[PDB]
Ligand binder design. Structure first.
Ligand SMILES: C[C@](N)(CO)C(=O)OP(=O)(O)OC[C@H]1O[C@@H](n2cnc3c(N)ncnc32)[C@H](O)[C@@H]1O
Ligand SMILES: [Cl-]
Ligand SMILES: [Cl-]
Ligand SMILES: [Cl-]
Ligand SMILES: [Cl-]
Ligand SMILES: [Cl-]
Ligand SMILES: [Cl-]
Length: 896
């Protein structure tokens, strides 16, 4: 070690100033609330006897007489006044319980505290206010309350000799001890860590103090200690370590720092009788070190003791140097564990004086304060948390978790049970009920093929308008026939079961026949865009191993393809064919399509899953054959798979639009007006453009819309209402999911946009899908907790990535929870308390921008669409229009 200078007690300079301690100084600058409070009920109080005791206390303890000179220093007083106790009298008052309800200071003015007595009929309520600057947690419980009990019992009773008054101790640490033997070798320890220190726990926010607590009885207190010992741990070390596990539950990162203050008086003779601020924040580093709870708790506990062996540097100095190194705001420690365990047994317990009825330490720059403190043989576990520091339920839920962790520790002999269990599930009972309830989406998908359902309908209603395309219409029978024509032809050219027939073409009726024939032939269509570069279209086909290519006659020659790949037009090269039905040869778990998306990978998608989506949307939004869908997404965009297999499988009418490149909302408002369209499906920016052009027209062109499904990007906050403007009765619905999740994998009826939402929600999960939110260990999190979205399903997930079975084996994992095969979407979100998911973006944590902007795009790893208004209500680069991507959406990569 390195011995510390002796304390030099000079009882003469008591009045003359001494400087503020570091803990206290940091408070005396935050004021420009902060004041603890207690309240004990007792049957009958003797104010006379009471008042004397409080005069004695003030007489005796110079700390109850110290004031803060406005110069920043503090001096004792000697003739302070008389103690101001304030009696309120509410005994014959009915609604005494009302006037008593309404309840709740300066170091320049003398009483740093606040005495009160309220006289209800038959019982009395002593109310002690007190200031967080005037003394500390241990001075309060071991000196102030211990003597207030003695002094109330006998105001004249014997009181200890006040050797070496606190002004020296402060003048000692500030001058004599700071700088020397131990302190130099301890400022090394922290300076050699302030770069490895993780930030404070990052819990969920929701963009006064409240209190959960429990009383561990004597019999359970003993066991709690025995359990901590069996691991070579002190109760405070077991509980810090449990509290550390519970926090990782919600924490937005597993490594964080806990302000764990020690109340060390440095073994000084007589000091354990002087009232003052012995507070030293230790910055404990919580990194998870260990495979089990014991292993991690034991490990962290060690780093706490090393952080303790080097205490003579006051944390307020570490906290200040941490702000030097980093930001200031990136250095607060608003999660603290305040343990009074292992201090000396105080003469008297405040419980003797009266039973508590209230108390709330209103610390400043503290959102959560876990207080471990013993009272009359019991351990009082207490969580004072600044209300609204945390999203709803987060703290109340973590307390449930914590109580259960501790619960198990008392239940589980060490080395068994929870102690050697790799993690603990922190999701509360509600967390789980609501998640199961919400994700009980299991429904048999009958093994009917996709084409065999459309055929089935064309024989059911053959006069029906199947496709309507470029004026040139198409009945179900005619489209069924031409598919057969195409189906049979291909199978004759040997399109064996499972082969991939590219459908390289531009928006036309010929696409609906090309797909439904490739399926009947026994294959699986590979859409590629007929607007990609001349070298890309052939590149995707060679990489996928696709021979036959169905195409339109126009721009057949504009297709530099090899000879080993046959090419048929589909508006002509097919008409002398057999309109006689093909017999399905493929199974329902075989591929219906391969849609393509740093290198580009291709998504194999089976029949069953598409079959599942289709017959849910239809049951979700009664899809009658009356409905007429404007099939606007491209066939190489995942968004199309409903337009292909949705309406036709039940009797409705696809309504192809005029091929486009730049979004042409003039034409669409027309085609929607003309063909009486009732079903809109596309990315939100296109259904916005369409609402733009529709609002600026005397007619009601979009008025036949009964249903609009925006998905695939950010559905803007105003958009559900601007559309719901035109055509009252339109029901809006937003969606999404990766192209690896078969078009739409979850739905959120947008009936009513909350103003204070950063984003529209994402959804509840559709049929046969489950949306988990997992930590980095693929474990479900509790509500509000930030995670990656793992979409679990046997029939709702893509089969895999076309050829590469590594990016498949990596992104389609087996969740350790349950065995469910699930897709790691690489999108981050958090569960909501109605069961929904909020979508936070994807690897965007360096993100709520349009949060500020709308109340205009986001930043980048800023762009709006006019003053120097940075932080307007808290590099901007305005732009006329924001740049769309290929399919719509908002091209965040092009922006920087
Ligand atoms: C499947 C689809 N939603 C269209 O229905 C889609 O976008 O296909 P994808 O873009 O090729 O698939 C991968 C990614 O899609 C992103 N995404 C879809 N919807 C989103 C919403 N509403 N908000 C944010 N991102 C969204 C995913 O993030 C996914 O990796
Ligand atoms: Cl009350
Ligand atoms: Cl040590
Ligand atoms: Cl050490
Ligand atoms: Cl709250
Ligand atoms: Cl609205
Ligand atoms: Cl895109």
């Amino acid at each position: 070690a390195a011995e510390l200078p002796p304390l030099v007690p000079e009882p003469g300079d008591a009045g003359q100033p001494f400087p503020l301690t570091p803990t206290q100084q940091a408070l005396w600058v935050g004021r420009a609330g902060c004041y603890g409070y207690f309240e004990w009920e007792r049957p009958e109080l003797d104010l006379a006897r009471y008042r004397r005791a409080w005069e004695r206390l003030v007489a005796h303890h110079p700390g109850l007489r110290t004031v803060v000179r406005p110069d920043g220093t503090q001096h004792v007083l000697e003739r302070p006044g008389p103690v101001p106790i304030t009696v309120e009298d509410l005994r014959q008052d009915p609604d005494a319980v009302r006037r008593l309800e309404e309840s709740r200071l300066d170091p320049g003015t003398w009483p740093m505290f606040d005495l009160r007595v309220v006289l209800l009929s038959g019982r009395v309520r002593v109310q002690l206010g007190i200031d967080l600057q005037l003394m500390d947690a241990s001075s309060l419980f071991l000196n102030l309350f211990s003597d207030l009990v003695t002094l109330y019992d006998d105001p004249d009773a014997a009181l200890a000799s006040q050797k070496l008054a606190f002004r020296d101790f402060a003048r000692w640490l500030e001058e004599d001890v700071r700088g020397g033997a131990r302190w130099r070798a301890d400022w090394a320890y922290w300076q050699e860590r302030l770069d490895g220190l993780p930030p404070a726990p990052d819990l969920p926010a929701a963009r006064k103090f409240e209190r959960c607590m429990v009383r561990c009885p004597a019999e359970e207190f003993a066991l709690l200690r025995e359990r901590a010992l069996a691991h070579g741990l002190t109760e405070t070390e077991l509980l810090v370590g449990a509290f550390a596990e519970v926090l990782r539950g919600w924490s937005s990162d597993p490594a964080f720092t806990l302000n764990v203050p020690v109340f060390q008086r440095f073994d000084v003779p007589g000091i354990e009788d002087v009232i003052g601020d012995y507070t030293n924040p230790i910055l404990l580093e919580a990194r998870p070190e260990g495979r089990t709870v014991a292993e991690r708790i034991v490990a962290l506990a060690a780093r706490l003791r090393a952080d303790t062996r080097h205490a003579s540097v006051n944390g307020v100095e570490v906290l200040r140097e941490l702000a030097r190194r980093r930001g200031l705001a990136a250095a607060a420690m608003p999660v603290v564990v305040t343990s009074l365990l292992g201090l000396p047994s105080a003469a008297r317990s405040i419980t003797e004086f009266g039973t508590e009825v209230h108390s709330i330490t209103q610390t400043p720059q503290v959102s959560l304060d876990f207080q471990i403190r013993p009272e009359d043989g019991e351990l009082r576990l207490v969580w004072d948390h600044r209300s609204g520091a945390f999203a709803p339920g987060v703290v109340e839920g973590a307390f449930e978790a914590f109580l259960d962790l501790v619960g198990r520790m008392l239940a589980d002999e060490p080395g068994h049970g929870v102690w050697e269990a790799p993690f603990a599930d922190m999701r509360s009972r509600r967390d789980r009920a609501v998640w199961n309830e919400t994700n009980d989406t299991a429904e048999p998908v009958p093994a009917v093929l996709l084409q065999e359902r459309f055929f089935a309908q064309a024989r059911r209603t053959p006069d029906a308008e199947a496709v309507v395309a470029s004026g040139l219409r198409l009945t179900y029978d005619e489209l069924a026939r031409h598919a057969y024509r195409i189906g049979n032809t291909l199978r004759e050219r040997g399109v064996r079961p499972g082969d991939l027939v590219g459908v390289v073409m531009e928006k036309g009726w010929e696409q609906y026949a090309a797909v439904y024939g490739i399926l009947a032939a026994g294959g699986a269509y590979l859409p590629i865009d007929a607007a990609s570069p001349r070298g890309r279209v052939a590149r995707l086909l060679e990489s996928a191993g696709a021979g036959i290519v169905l195409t339109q006659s126009r721009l057949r020659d504009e297709l530099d393809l090899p000879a080993g790949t046959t090419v048929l037009r589909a508006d002509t090269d097919f008409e002398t064919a057999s309109t006689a039905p093909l017999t399905p040869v493929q199974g329902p778990d075989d591929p219906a399509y391969v849609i393509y998306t740093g290198e580009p990978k291709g998504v194999v998608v089976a029949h069953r899953g598409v079959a599942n989506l289709v017959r849910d949307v239809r049951r979700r939004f009664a899809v009658t054959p009356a409905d007429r869908l404007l099939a606007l997404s491209g066939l190489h965009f995942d968004a199309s798979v409903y337009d292909v297999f949705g309406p036709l499988a039940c009797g409705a009418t696809v309504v192809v639009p005029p091929p486009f490149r730049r979004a042409e909302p003039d034409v669409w408002a027309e085609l929607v007006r003309d063909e009486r369209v009732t079903f809109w499906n596309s990315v939100p920016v296109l259904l916005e453009l369409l609402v733009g052009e529709a609002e600026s027209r005397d007619d009601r062109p979009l008025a036949t819309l009964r249903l609009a499904v925006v998905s695939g990007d950010w559905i803007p906050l105003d958009l559900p209402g601007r559309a719901r403007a035109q055509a009252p009765g339109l029901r809006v619905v937003g969606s999404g999911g990766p192209t690896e999740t078969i078009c739409w994998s979850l739905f959120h009826p947008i009936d009513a946009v909350d103003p204070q939402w950063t984003s529209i929600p994402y959804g509840k999960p559709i049929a046969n899908q489950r949306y988990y939110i997992v930590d980095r260990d693929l474990r479900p999190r509790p509500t509000w907790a930030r995670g990656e979205m793992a979409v679990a399903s046997p029939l709702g997930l893509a089969l895999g990535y076309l050829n590469d079975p590594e990016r498949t084996a990596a992104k389609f994992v087996t969740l350790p929870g349950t065995g469910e095969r699930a897709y790691l979407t690489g999108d981050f979100g958090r569960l909501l308390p109605d069961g929904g998911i909020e979508i936070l973006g994807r690897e965007d944590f360096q993100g709520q921008r349009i949060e500020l902007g709308e109340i205009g795009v986001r930043a980048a790893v800023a762009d709006v669409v006019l003053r120097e208004h940075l932080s307007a209500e808290l590099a901007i680069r305005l732009l006329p229009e924001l740049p769309l991507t290929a399919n719509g959406k908002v091209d965040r990569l092009a922006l920087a």
